[PDB]
Every structure is written in C-alpha cells, then in structure tokens.
Design a protein around this nucleic acid. Structure first.
Ligand SMILES: [Mg+2]
Ligand SMILES: [Mg+2]
Ligand SMILES: [Mg+2]
Ligand SMILES: [Mg+2]
Ligand SMILES: [Mg+2]
Ligand SMILES: [Mg+2]
Ligand SMILES: [Mg+2]
Ligand SMILES: [Mg+2]
Ligand SMILES: [Mg+2]
Ligand SMILES: [Mg+2]
Ligand SMILES: [Mg+2]
Ligand SMILES: [Mg+2]
Ligand SMILES: [Mg+2]
Ligand SMILES: [Mg+2]
Ligand SMILES: [Mg+2]
Ligand SMILES: [Mg+2]
Ligand SMILES: [Mg+2]
Ligand SMILES: [Mg+2]
Ligand SMILES: [Mg+2]
Ligand SMILES: [Mg+2]
Ligand SMILES: [Mg+2]
Ligand SMILES: [Mg+2]
Ligand SMILES: [Mg+2]
Ligand SMILES: [Mg+2]
Ligand SMILES: [Mg+2]
Ligand SMILES: [Mg+2]
Ligand SMILES: [Mg+2]
Ligand SMILES: [Mg+2]
Ligand SMILES: [Mg+2]
Ligand SMILES: [Mg+2]
Ligand SMILES: [Mg+2]
Ligand SMILES: [Mg+2]
Ligand SMILES: [Mg+2]
Ligand SMILES: [Mg+2]
Ligand SMILES: [Mg+2]
Ligand SMILES: [Mg+2]
Ligand SMILES: [Mg+2]
Ligand SMILES: [Mg+2]
Ligand SMILES: [Mg+2]
Ligand SMILES: [Mg+2]
Ligand SMILES: [Mg+2]
Ligand SMILES: [Mg+2]
Ligand SMILES: [Mg+2]
Ligand SMILES: [Mg+2]
Lengths: 158, 262, 134
RNA sequence: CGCGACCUCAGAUCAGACGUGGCGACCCGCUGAAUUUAAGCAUAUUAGUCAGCGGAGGAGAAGAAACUAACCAGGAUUCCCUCAGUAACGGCGAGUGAACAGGGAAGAGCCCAGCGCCGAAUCCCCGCCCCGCGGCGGGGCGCGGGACAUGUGGCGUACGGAAGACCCGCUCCCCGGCGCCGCUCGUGGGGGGCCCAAGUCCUUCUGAUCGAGGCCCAGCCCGUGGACGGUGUGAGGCCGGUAGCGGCCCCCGGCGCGCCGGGCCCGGGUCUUCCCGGAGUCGGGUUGCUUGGGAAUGCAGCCCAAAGCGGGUGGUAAACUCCAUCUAAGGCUAAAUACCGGCACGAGACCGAUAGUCAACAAGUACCGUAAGGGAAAGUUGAAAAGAACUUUGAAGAGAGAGUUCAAGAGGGCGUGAAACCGUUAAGAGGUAAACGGGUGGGGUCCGCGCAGUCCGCCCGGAGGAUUCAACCCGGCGGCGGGUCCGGCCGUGUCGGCGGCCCGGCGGAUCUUUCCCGCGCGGGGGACCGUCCCCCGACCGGCGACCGGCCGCCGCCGGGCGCAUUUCCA
RNA sequence: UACCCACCCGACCCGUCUUGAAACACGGACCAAGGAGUCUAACACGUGCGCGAGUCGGGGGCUCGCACGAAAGCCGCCGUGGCGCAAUGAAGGUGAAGGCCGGCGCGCUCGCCGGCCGAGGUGGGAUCCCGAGGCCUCUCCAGUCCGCCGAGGGCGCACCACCGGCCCGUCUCGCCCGCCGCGCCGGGGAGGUGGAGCACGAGCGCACGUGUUAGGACCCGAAAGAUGGUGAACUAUGCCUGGG
RNA sequence: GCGAAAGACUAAUCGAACCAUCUAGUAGCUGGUUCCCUCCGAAGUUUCCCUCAGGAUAGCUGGCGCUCUCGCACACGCAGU
RNA sequence: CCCCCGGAGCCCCGCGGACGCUACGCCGCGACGAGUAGGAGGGCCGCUGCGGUGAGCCUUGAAGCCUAGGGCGCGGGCCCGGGUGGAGCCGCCGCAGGUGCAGAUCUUGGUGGUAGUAGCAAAUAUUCAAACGAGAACUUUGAAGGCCGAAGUGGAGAAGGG
RNA sequence: CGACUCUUAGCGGUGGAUCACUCGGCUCGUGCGUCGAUGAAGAACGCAGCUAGCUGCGAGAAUUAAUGUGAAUUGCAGGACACAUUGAUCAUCGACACUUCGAACGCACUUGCGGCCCCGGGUUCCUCCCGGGGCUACGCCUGUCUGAGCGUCGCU
C-alpha cells in the first residue's frame, strides 16, 4: 500500500531468498587459503615467474573500450613463425599460446612480436642437466639470479 | 538454529474445546501432547524472528575518516591533560610524546624491558594495570572472558628486531607498528588519548607516514592532514584582546529581583 | 599468552578434559613437588606421585611436618590416601582423608628402574634448556 | 548319411573377474503442486521450488566455440565483482526478468573415428624359469590357448598432417627393481610418544585461602612462558600446562646420488604431390513443456528430412543480395569453484537448564498409536560421606538426646530458597462483603535522642597558663612577574641572496630522441614550471618557544632578632 | 512516609471492542516463571560526520601460526564502475551561450568579418557600504579624536515573484544556402509550444531517526489446497476354511 | 474403498480416512501488545474503488525546520472581528 | 598644582575579576502547562552483553533473597537500617541487545476457594468361635446361615495375554 | 481473652522462582573428505565374580596379541604377581577374531526344509544313521567345456 511519493519498487523477494543466502564469513579465511597457494606455487617452481607465463598485448573489443589494452589469452600462432619460436616449445618456455586468434594488422602483430623478442633476450634458460650443452644461458647468467618475477611478467601499461 | 522449537507437528485444535487456539502437539501419552508449539509465547516453541546469521554484523568507514581518526588519537597522545585524564598515571614521566633510543627494538628479554619502564618512570601505569585484575562481572566469565584489566602504555617501533618478544608478558602493553597503527588500540573504548612510547626510528617516520601539512604523506598515495576549523583554539585570549573588548557594549548585571506591587 | 592453535584455552573444554581424562594421563596430572633436599640433589622440580612415596602435607586442615607414606591413589576421585592422614568416623572406624598431590611435598621418592630414568631424562631436559639458553 | 568350417544361439555350482544396499550437505538427470501472490479469479507467480524419483565424488557438472563480436577486435571451464536489477515478458500487471564488453581468482591443454601410410607393427588368457610381491608387476623362454582381416599397434587429426626433395643443427628421455645420500617451513614436512622457569618465602586473615601488607626495581623469583584448567575461596611461582629453529625416540610422508634390469635412433628449420569432418544426424513442419529467446531461447514426441566453395551462426518472418566467424553428428581434464551429511579441530558482542538442539542427566530415552509416526519430564549436599555410631521412645513409619560438620535454619529430590498458598505465636479490629480515595486521631513496632540538644564557626575584650616567633635584616635555595628583545636560540608575515637549485625532493600528458642504455617505443639520464631547503642581510607578529643576564615581587630553608612581640591552650 | 486500628468526606471492576460499559456484552480463580513490532533488501525524507566536480568499494591484491585477528594497515588499485558530473527524443541524433561594440554584406530586427565583455534584466530581497544632520564635551572661539543617535543614498547574496535567454522534441512560418562529390544531400532563420532541460555545481561516501514496502513479518489466531506415505485390530462387502 | 441403497462404514474419525511435509499457508476478520514524566494534540470529513468490516486520495496532527520583523523610544503584515 | 588605586577605600570602579563560569553552567523577567490515537521530546528510569575507565567493592561476606529498620524522586526507581547467604559483584564514559507484563478461553509448573464438600447404591447374606498375629469387621480354620446353581460363579482350551 | 474472620506482623511448611554455577547446546571458522558381497549401513540376542540401564564388546564377547606408557585397579570382593618384571592400568592400535537377521546369498522364512563336496563314529562306502569341514542367491564381462539350429556353406 503506497503512501505519497516513493518509487515503485519491484523488490524480488517473492521467491525464497531465505533458504539460499550465502553469507561471506569465509571471505577473510578464503583470502588466506588463496595466500597460501600464491605462496606455495612460487616456492615449488622456484626460479620461474611467479605470476605465470608471458602473455600478449591485446586490444579490448567493443567501441567504448577500443583505447585500452590487455594481457590477452596467449600470443597468436602467426605471431610465432616470425619470432622464430616453435609453438610446442613456447609452451615449455613460459610463453602463452592461444592458437585461436585471427591476426588482422601488422601494427599489433609486430607490437606483440617485440614482446617475444624482448623475452628471449632477458630469459635465463636453466639447462636440462647441470653439465648441459647449447642454448642454456651460462653459469654467470645463472649465478646472478634466483629471481622470481613478482607481479605480471613485463606488465602491460597503457 | 532454523529449526528452533519448530520440529513438532502440532495442528491446533481451535475453538469448541475451551483451550486457546495455539498449535498444540499431537496424540501421545507423554505430558508433551497438547502443550503448544510454535508460539513465542510457549515452552519449546521459539523466539521473535530467530536471530539470523545474515544480520549486517560488520560495518564501514571511509579511509579518510579513519585516517584522521588516528590523527586525533595521536595528537591527543600528547597533551598530558587528556592522557592523564584516562588514568594513565603519567606524573613522574619526563616528557609526553615520549621518545626512546632505537636500542629498544633489540631487547630480547622481559627483564630488559621492565628495566626500561622503570627508568622512564612508567612502571606505575603497568603497576596500575597490575592492580586492576579481577573477575568480569557477568556471564562472560563462563565464556573465555573471565579476567579483565586496564590498558597499559602503547609502545611503537618501526621494526620488530626482537622487541615485541620482550614487551609481551608485561600486562597492559600493546605493541603497534608505526606503519600499521590502529584506532582500536590507540584510542580504546572510543575515548581519546593513550600513553605512547615512540622509539626514535618510529617517531621520525610519523611525518613521512601520514604527512606534515605543507607536504604530502609520501607513503600514502594521496593523503594530507586535516585542516582545522579554527587556529586559536583557546578563546580566553581572544575574548580579552583589545580588538574585541574595545568593540563591545558595556554589561548589564544589576540583576533585578522583581518588584512586589503595593 | 598461549599461541599455538592446535591447543584449547576454553573455560569448558579443558574443564571437561579433566573429569574425563583416562588413568593414562592422570599420572602426569597427579604430580607433586619434591622437597628442597631432593630438588637440589636430583635437578627435578616435580614428580608423578606413586603408591609408597613418603610425603609431607603442606596445606589443608592437618598440614604438618610429619612424614607419612602414601597408601593408595584414587586416580578416580583423583586424590591420594596417606598414613596418619586420617579421621575417626562415628563408630571409631578410622578412614583416611583425601589430599592432592598438588597440596603435598615428596620427601623420599621410592626409586626404581622405571622411575630413575625419568629423573635422569627430566634433569637432562632441564639442563639442555639451560645449555641451549647459554 | 556322415564328417568339417563358420554364423547365430543355449547350457555349465566351469577358470577368473564384477554388479547390486546404504550414506546422502554439496553434486548430476528428470518430475513436479498447491498454499501462496495478483486485494477474486482461471492468465501469470510460488517456480523447475517440495515431495517423488533417478545418479555420482572428495568435491560434483563443464571444458578447448558450429563461441564471442562488429573492435583499431577478442579467444576453453568455473567462480567473485561488475554489467545490474539493466535489453525484454506480462488480464505489459504481479512479477518477472538475463545477457554482451572490463577487472580479478585461477588458469593447461588435449585426445578419438575417418583419409592414408606402415608382413597386426596389436591385443587378450595359459606353462616354465629370473627378479618383484600388505595398491599383482616387470624380465626372459616356450608350434601353450584365443581375438582380430566385418580389423588389433605406430604416425596423425585440422592450430595442419602426411608424404616427398635438398636448407640447418646434433643425439637423453621413459619405466621394473635394487640400493644409498641430503627428514625436505612455521618458522623440523604428518602422526605418536616421550620430555624442558620461577615462593607454598615472611607475617596475617580463614574451616580451608588462592585473599592483604611485606620481602634487595610493585615487594622476593621467573618471565621467547602473566592463555586456560586443576588444585576444601580470587593463585604468573603448587600441578598440568603456556611460551620457547626447546630436546630426544619411533613411525609415516615426500622429495636428492649410485647400481642395475629393461625399454628408445625419438631433432630443427626450406621447395613440391596429394588428403581431409563423423546421418535417420543437421535442417524443416508440428505439436508438448521451459525462458526471457521472442513470426519459436531452450528442450520434446511425431511427420517430412538434406548438402559438400557445404553447414551453423551472425537474436521481428521472408526473398534476393552482398560481408564476418566457427566447424557440429565421437571423447578427457586439474585449478580456483560448492559443502546444515562424516571425521577432526579452533573460536564467539551467543544461550545459558520452562533458555539453549527433542536431548547438560537411562534422549531420540520413558510413554502413546496397530502403523506412518508421535514423543516427554528430569542439572546443584558438602570440600570430605566426615552420610546420625550410641542411649532412648516408639509393632513399624517417625521422633528426643547425642554425634558429625565453618555451616545440617547444607541431611541423601541436600547450594539459595520468593509468591500464591497454607502452618501456628502477638496486636488490633469486626451487624451494612470486602476492598479503595481525601482528612485527621489512638496504638504499636521500631528509629533519633537528651540522664540540658542548648547547636556550632569568626573576630574581639578581659583574666589565667605555655612554646618560639613572627615585623627586620643576612646566607642560601626555589618560584613568579617585568622589561632592555640586552645578548643568544625560536618560529610568522615581507624583502635580499638564485644562495639549496646538481651537494632539495616530488608532481606535472611541461621540453630535448643536440644526451646515454635497451629494444618508433620502453628505461635511464639532461632542460621547464609548480612545489618544498640553506646563507645571510633588512622590516614585522617578538608570538607560552626558550635561554642567559639585570630587575621588581613572593615563597621555603638556614642564620640572626628573647619578648609591651608572635604564637598554643583553657 | 510505611503497620494495625479509629473516624469524617469521596467511591462501581479492570481490560477491551466500542455514538455510548459498573454492564443483565466478552477475557479475567490465584501465583510464579515465559510472552508479541524483530532481521534483511530496496526506496524516500530528516539529520550526524569525511572529502568535494568527486567521492567511494568492493571484489580483488600486497602485509599471519591471529592471542588480540577471522581484526588493522596499505594498493599507477582508486577506477575496470556506481553514483554524480546534462537532456531530450518512439528511433537516426542533438546537445545549454548570451550581451555588446565596430566593420563588412542594403543592419532587410536576414548573412558574414574584427574587437570588447561574459552568464540577461525587474521587483522584492538578511543585508554590507556610503552617509546630510544632530547629540555632548566648565566659559568664547578654534579645532583634531571618539562614540551614540541618524533622514537620505550605494553594492546586494539565499530565497521568493516576475520579466528575458540558450539545448533537445514537435508544430507553424518563412529566409539564405555549402557543395567530395548530384541534393527527392546536407545546412543554416523567425515565431510558437512540449521537456522529469541548461542559465557559473552538490554529489559522492559513511552514520542514525522516521517512514514505506518487499520480505513468516508484531504475536497469536481458520474452514481449505497440494505432495507423498499407513491402515479392513472396528465395520462394509466379496471369497476361502472351520462351529451352532 | 466398500454400502439389500439409509451419505451407511474405512479401527471413539466419513458429504469421503489417518500420518508427515509444502507449513510462519492465507486472512479487509476476533484477542493482545509489557517502564516514568513534559508538550501539542484528531477524525469519523473529500473525490475513485468488485467500493459499504476495507482501502485510495481530500482534510485535521506532530515533528522537523527554515525566510524574515522588532520591543534594542524609532513595525509591516495578517486576521470565523 | 588640580599629582601614583599594588591603593578610591570601595553602589562603580572601564587597572582584574562570582561564590556563580559542568559556557549544553546558572539567573530574571513575564507568560502560560483538560487529553483518548499519534507524534515528539526528555528520562544519574529499568534489564542483560562488550571496549574503556573507576590503585571501584568482596571470605572483615557478593547476588539473590528477606524485612509495622531512616530516607529521597513528582516517578522509572532509587537510595539507606537488620538477617541469610554463601561467591563473586557493582559506579561513570562509550558501544551492543532476544529489553521492562495483569490482559491475549496467552505458554509451562504450582496453589486455592469450592471442601473436608460430591461421593465409595447393580448380583437377596451374613453370624459365631478359635488361630495367627503389636494391631483383625477385611486373613485363616472350624461351626452355622446363604447364594451360583450344570444354558453355572462348575471343570479344560484359542486368540489374546505373557 | 469466649469461637470464626480480616489485616498486619513473629515464626513452622509448599512450592519450587530468583540468584550463583555448568563435562550441554548454538552459531561461525579451519583441516581433512572415512562403505560393500573379502560381504556395509541398519537390526536381534548374548557377554562382568558379584550388573538392571547406558556404554563397550562378540562364543575368542565389559575383549584378542603388540608398543608406549608406565603402578595400580577399586562400590565390595578377589586375586596374580616376585612393581629388577610386554611388568598392574590406560592409550594407541598394526597382530588375530566377526553370535543371529540384513543388498542377507541353497529355498523359504516355520525357524523347516534341502542339495552337492570332504574328515570323525558308523560303515569299514553299506547306506543310512550319528558326528565334523567346503560349497549352493540373481545379473553381467573375459575366457573354457558341452551343446542346438531345413542359418550359410564345404567335403563326401
Ligand atoms: Mg594471476
Ligand atoms: Mg527453544
Ligand atoms: Mg546477574
Ligand atoms: Mg548407489
Ligand atoms: Mg486477500
Ligand atoms: Mg488471490
Ligand atoms: Mg481464494
Ligand atoms: Mg497459474
Ligand atoms: Mg516456471
Ligand atoms: Mg521465473
Ligand atoms: Mg526434492
Ligand atoms: Mg566467455
Ligand atoms: Mg593460575
Ligand atoms: Mg582457580
Ligand atoms: Mg611448571
Ligand atoms: Mg539438435
Ligand atoms: Mg514459465
Ligand atoms: Mg566438442
Ligand atoms: Mg567429461
Ligand atoms: Mg570431472
Ligand atoms: Mg528444569
Ligand atoms: Mg530444555
Ligand atoms: Mg533446587
Ligand atoms: Mg534451582
Ligand atoms: Mg549455611
Ligand atoms: Mg546451605
Ligand atoms: Mg559452592
Ligand atoms: Mg533448602
Ligand atoms: Mg502467617
Ligand atoms: Mg489474636
Ligand atoms: Mg469491529
Ligand atoms: Mg443492562
Ligand atoms: Mg467477543
Ligand atoms: Mg545503475
Ligand atoms: Mg483451491
Ligand atoms: Mg439425505
Ligand atoms: Mg498535559
Ligand atoms: Mg541477547
Ligand atoms: Mg516476565
Ligand atoms: Mg436367583
Ligand atoms: Mg482352571
Ligand atoms: Mg524446574
Ligand atoms: Mg531454576
Ligand atoms: Mg546345422
């Protein structure tokens, strides 16, 4: 029974909110459950970027959002034959492969290629064995670091 | 519980039977059979509006509100008036924003700590705590909340280099990091002005923590101290400046008992 | 303060873990201190009381210096039963009266294979803590 | 009128496996209302909810697009925020009512069938040995079985792959054992056991202390321990404990080297030849449920039923027509994600025994109903049974003494022990039922007193009696106030130093890539403005911000002053 | 003041529904204990506090075995967004700006070009400023200081009333066009009207009061409806088998 | 369901059982709604209602307020006149 | 000349100010204070919980309970006198409620009046003596009177009962 | 003062409020995520020196062996033992056990009926009979044996 100026209100509580209410007194213990994963995963994979693999620069879709940029899913395929990285190798080298992106422009292609070219250069390939041959980066470039990258690898700033 | 007194299967034999029209319990050769169930009014039964879990237990403050709550608590951690007037037994203390060497972060034994609190003449707050230990009045006693006591001096330190261990067993003392101050603990009870012991390391970090005034915090993102609503807080000086007194009508204080008419 | 969660601190829960603890544990609980002589000689503060151990009452109605020997141990009533520690009933039939370990002091331990090794191992732990603190 | 292959199909208490019930919060299929709501009412909603039913696991489902989009594009799932209570639906009304983009948790990808390539390269079950045996497995050897040619292995699967040619560079994984070395985060992984400070010090309360003063710094000790519980009252110290990369002993977990037995000739990049999608499926017509999906979102039955530059999609039917984007008909999967059931814990602004769960206890117990089912009441002696020995009355129940108890006016349904209610003792009343309001009076129990309540406090005058002073200086100490802002230190406003400016930073899409580093961009440096510091100089608020001297005054202490003073007393 | 008693005056038993209850209306023997406006979401106004054309809050992150801790702190997060920062139209979309001056186009109250000022005015408008004139002041005059009074005049917020203006919709009317393009192209005027508009801002966040709903919903209070189950031990029938 | 037929009977139950759940079912309708004091203080009137036991809006009420005046020798306004 | 209050000696004192000035304190004027529903305000009115704080109180006796023990508020209640009780409790400043009962044929438990009231009425039936026993109308034995009256109150079974 | 009655008081009960405790709830978190035909969940009955109930257990029954632990146990008895000893007790549990129903399994549920294997006595397989041990429920998979079919053939 309305009285003198309000809104209409179709509050939707005619069903049964009561039974299916989730309260959130997990929230903070969950915060911590999470903490211990972030934590543990890093200590397990010791030298490896804690955040996760390298992930591509990418443009947001719909018209409003245009001007932004993101970590995309993974770098395209077309992208790799160009950087000279085999797609199945990339996946082992902490390089994120989406294989499902239609690459339409040379602008965002080379932009995103430069990230791989950049990655190669500042990547210490820790060798199969200790007494190991080619492509693994030398015992100097090896001693210097035990360094997990905290935060997103080569973070994408607009 | 959601089932509180609500597990009964009682119809209510309403009207024509004297009784009362409550829902009354079925069959039986017990006594609990034709009692009443699901009435607030009745045994077994249940309350008004079962106290539910999704009560809005917790609450809310704006960052700025609760930053300059700390300001006001800290500013009154000077001013022996307010600090004493919490019964913080500061009389033989040398000075009030009480700063101490940064040797203190490194005591690792309660005996050292205790010898500091003598030599800063600050026993007698802990002493006081130490006399105020009794059994809580009420029902809390039978719930993990039996004893109680005063608060003792707050002690603050930019880095636990062993200190918090030392000042722990001493009753009343709470440690607070400077980087992580807390209004609950600086201003307990929502009253202002607790006795605090800055250690030089910490005491420097206060302006860089959360600002001087004509300078950013440089440790919080954007935060600067609250401005005052007025500068000359004493008005008694104001009220007998010659500026004011000159421009005032002369009093009226004959008073004026009313006149009985004859 | 306690800390270790994985321990209780609950008015009720360790009130409970009292008059429901098994005889296994009640030994440790039913311990009394040693007299200065032994506490010196042996480097052990307090011992589990045992059936034939000699004991001085310290608190209670009938405190004294009389070294009586322990007779038996209600670990059920969870209380010990000593020698001239006793009262006369209405009929003359003397009955002993209960006392804790905690309100009593050991003046002569009754030694053994199994009890010696505890006295060694407690005294070894004491000194390991003092050598660790050193 | 035989024997033999196969195909179909039986029988075996055959050899070996396995399935079935329960649990059921969470999980998945389906099924499925009506109260209720709409002020009725059937449309709608409750609501794909409850019951019903079916099904799983430590989580369940889903999942590697027949997606999203309309961007300059993104890129499996789920989840949280967000969209957003929005697009639409609706006797367009009650309600209903999602999605697309972004941010974030987490984040992993992959496998079939076919086309083909490869002496089935395969697979199953026996027998003998070699190792292995408390999740039955490797190694070998056997014209020991059998499936499989209606098709078993490898590569391969669309993000290309196969096959060829020559372009480049070069060779370590897997598994059965069998050892051994580093016990491998709460701050030595899991579990168990076992273990690690300090007073029963004085005195004094008390039945008993754990209480109150004290005790070489709030007393003594300890204090990486002062949580808690026990302990004839409130106990850091008595005891268990607590804290404490505190100790040690088993076991269990997991990860590191060796030996061995087996398995494996597994790359990378270029030019050509060809080779490709899963049918009664898509789609359509229809009907039925569903959502929000719509001139059809989803799911159904039936009817009709495809193609191969095709098919779906690209959200008001449709033709034409242009563009985008996936690729179904086969399939798997951690992670976040859910958890009123279980085991095991931790806590609380909680309830505190007519509350709190039905249940603090013989609680799902007693009892009821034939049965489905229904389903209670009921905690407390004391500290210790020390629970009345013994005399006596009484058939006995009960008493009186006595005894025990700090307390039995704590006596076995015992802390306390209300009111209704009843028990008797004392006082007073009593023909209009009691009971009530206003006003007095009498009497009591008590309560103040007074064996004068003459209540106190100044000042003064008088008369007695008694100490050292007050007034004064002088020595000291400590305040206060004043100013000369005298001298210095302090800060407000102004000016000067352009002096910090690079030895002062940080902010700014300010400017230079004349610079440097890394790849036009990023980082760094250099210029600019706004900001915040030094030097010194000048003015002014000269400010509670002092500190030094000079002053003026006060107070205290110590000297002097012996008595017409200055106190005390009556 | 309270207990009993005494008197004098007063005097119906409460609760409730009720035009009207002592009711010849209903509840109510007495006493103990229990017992009824609760929580959440959403609005709305009122108010409190923070910051302010912003402001937030999460959800996320970074910082704990929590003793206190499931706290507090902090984050180009800090804004990916909400709310606000602008409306109007069904929709394509448009979008708050006027004055003045000079010059140029015939100032044609039409078009364009240079400068100046910038939210138009009127009436009320707390009101701040100016203020003629008093009004003293031991003498006559002179005169600076100082207040009180002060007719009269000026700026005028907030607000109210009005008159003006600009954006969008729609109408009417009527002018000139630009010309990446051709105008069934786009574009510009005048007047009127519709708009929950702009016309030099007030929101955001967080409290609390009230209220209104949605919620079981202040508690108690039906006849019903639905879904699943148990019963022929009574009785009703049928049947089977016994007895009189 | 069962009825030689009477709405008989279905275990003290029948115009159609009992048990549990949906279940706080709904109720314009009965009843009640728990501490003091101070101040102001109604209506049973308006139009629409599947409205006549109820709602909708007219009123009247309180609260919250605000804009001002001037009783500070120096007031305009309002009004059951 | 017409001089300085650290002194005019003060009803005016402007050189410095109540005892009074909890600056939401206190003081003087006037004026006014019928109330259901409702609002609003005020409640050192009341209940239970926590953060503060009260060198709070407490085995030299708390809560409750009880009091023809003194009082105070208008009153919510509050404060004081004694006894008993035996373990804990309160005051202020805040915060938090499942928050204050006479009512609901309200819920549970208890208790009255009624009231020592209704009532112990279906089958004709008992009496004596002894025993036993503390105690006998009620048990037993004897004796006597009676009934059921073989379609039984006789003697055996089913189902049920256990 | 006669008795009753009412009020109040002084005490006696009745009742069980109030208060004060609390081995229980409730709520909220965390860790793990535990069945079975080898025979579960659920029930029946039995088991102690004196034991009705709860609880614990299973004819090997108020437990079994073992390892810690390390002297009790106890309402009362009674006990071994040698407390210089698996050594009392308790916890753990890992060694062994598992009465009857039950998905309940030979068929039915009376508690009766059987079948088929073994080993005692009986026999001296002579068959019962008496004694003892193992199997025997339905579905279905891989395999095996035995088959059926005017199904399709082949050879005769
Ligand atoms: Mg991440
Ligand atoms: Mg309840
Ligand atoms: Mg209380
Ligand atoms: Mg199953
Ligand atoms: Mg209705
Ligand atoms: Mg309806
Ligand atoms: Mg209806
Ligand atoms: Mg419907
Ligand atoms: Mg539906
Ligand atoms: Mg719906
Ligand atoms: Mg269901
Ligand atoms: Mg998606
Ligand atoms: Mg203690
Ligand atoms: Mg204690
Ligand atoms: Mg100890
Ligand atoms: Mg389909
Ligand atoms: Mg629907
Ligand atoms: Mg697929
Ligand atoms: Mg799957
Ligand atoms: Mg799965
Ligand atoms: Mg009870
Ligand atoms: Mg209960
Ligand atoms: Mg009791
Ligand atoms: Mg009681
Ligand atoms: Mg007593
Ligand atoms: Mg007592
Ligand atoms: Mg007690
Ligand atoms: Mg009693
Ligand atoms: Mg009486
Ligand atoms: Mg009398
Ligand atoms: Mg009515
Ligand atoms: Mg009448
Ligand atoms: Mg009535
Ligand atoms: Mg919105
Ligand atoms: Mg109906
Ligand atoms: Mg009829
Ligand atoms: Mg009034
Ligand atoms: Mg509460
Ligand atoms: Mg009550
Ligand atoms: Mg006859
Ligand atoms: Mg017979
Ligand atoms: Mg009771
Ligand atoms: Mg009680
Ligand atoms: Mg044949």
């Amino acid at each position: 029974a309305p009285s003198r100026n309000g809104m209409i209100l179709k509050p939707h509580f005619h069903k049964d909110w009561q039974r299916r209410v989730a309260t959130w007194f997990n929230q903070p213990a969950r915060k911590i459950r999470r903490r211990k994963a972030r934590q543990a995963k890093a200590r397990r994979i010791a030298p490896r970027p804690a955040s996760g693999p390298l992930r591509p620069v990418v443009r947001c879709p719909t018209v409003r959002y245009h001007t932004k940029v993101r970590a995309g899913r993974g770098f395209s395929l077309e992208e790799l034959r160009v950087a000279g990285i085999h797609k199945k190798v990339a996946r082992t080298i902490g390089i994120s492969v989406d294989p499902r992106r239609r690459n339409k422009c040379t602008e965002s292609l080379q932009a995103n290629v430069q990230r791989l070219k950049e990655y190669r250069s500042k990547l210490i390939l820790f060798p199969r064995k200790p007494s190991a041959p080619k492509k693994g980066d030398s015992s100097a470039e090896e001693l210097k670091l035990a360094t997990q990258l905290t935060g997103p690898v080569m973070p994408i700033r607009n | 519980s959601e089932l509180a007194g609500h597990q009964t299967s009682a119809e209510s034999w309403g009207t024509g039977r004297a009784v009362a029209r409550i829902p009354r319990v079925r069959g039986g050769g017990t006594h609990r059979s034709g009692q009443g169930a699901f009435g607030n009014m009745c045994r077994g039964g249940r309350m008004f509006a079962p106290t539910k879990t999704w009560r809005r237990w917790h609450r809310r403050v704006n960052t700025t509100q609760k930053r300059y709550a700390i300001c006001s608590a800290l500013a009154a951690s000077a001013l022996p008036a307010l600090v004493m007037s919490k019964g913080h037994r500061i009389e033989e203390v040398p000075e009030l924003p009480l700063v101490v060497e940064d040797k203190v972060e490194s005591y690792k034994k309660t005996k050292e700590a205790v010898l500091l609190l003598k030599k800063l003449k600050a026993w007698n707050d802990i002493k006081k705590v130490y006399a105020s230990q009794r059994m809580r009045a009420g029902k809390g006693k039978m719930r993990n909340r039996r004893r109680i006591q005063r608060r003792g001096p707050c002690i603050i330190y930019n880095e636990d280099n062993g200190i918090i261990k030392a000042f722990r067993n001493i009753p009343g003392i709470t440690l607070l990091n400077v980087s992580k101050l807390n209004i609950l603990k600086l201003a307990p009870g929502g009253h202002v002005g607790r006795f605090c012991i800055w250690t030089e390391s910490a005491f420097r970090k206060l302006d860089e923590l959360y600002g001087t005034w004509r300078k950013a915090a440089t440790l919080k993102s954007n935060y600067n101290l609250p401005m005052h609503k007025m500068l000359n807080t004493d008005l008694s000086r104001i009220l007998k400046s010659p500026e004011i007194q000159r421009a005032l009508r002369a009093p009226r204080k004959k008073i004026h008992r009313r006149v009985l008419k004859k | 303060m306690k800390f270790n969660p994985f321990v209780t601190s609950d008015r009720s829960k360790n009130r409970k873990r009292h008059f429901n603890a098994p005889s296994h544990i009640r030994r440790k609980i039913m311990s009394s201190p040693l007299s200065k002589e032994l506490r010196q000689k042996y480097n052990v503060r307090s011992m589990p009381i045992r059936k034939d151990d000699e004991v001085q009452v310290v608190r209670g109605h009938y405190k004294g210096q009389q070294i009586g020997k322990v007779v038996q141990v209600y670990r059920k009533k969870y209380v010990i039963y000593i020698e001239r520690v006793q009262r006369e009933k209405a009929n003359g039939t003397t009955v002993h009266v209960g006392i804790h370990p905690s309100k009593v002091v050991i003046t002569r331990l009754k030694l053994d294979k199994d009890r010696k090794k505890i006295l060694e191992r407690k005294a070894k732990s004491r000194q390991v803590g003092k050598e660790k603190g050193k």
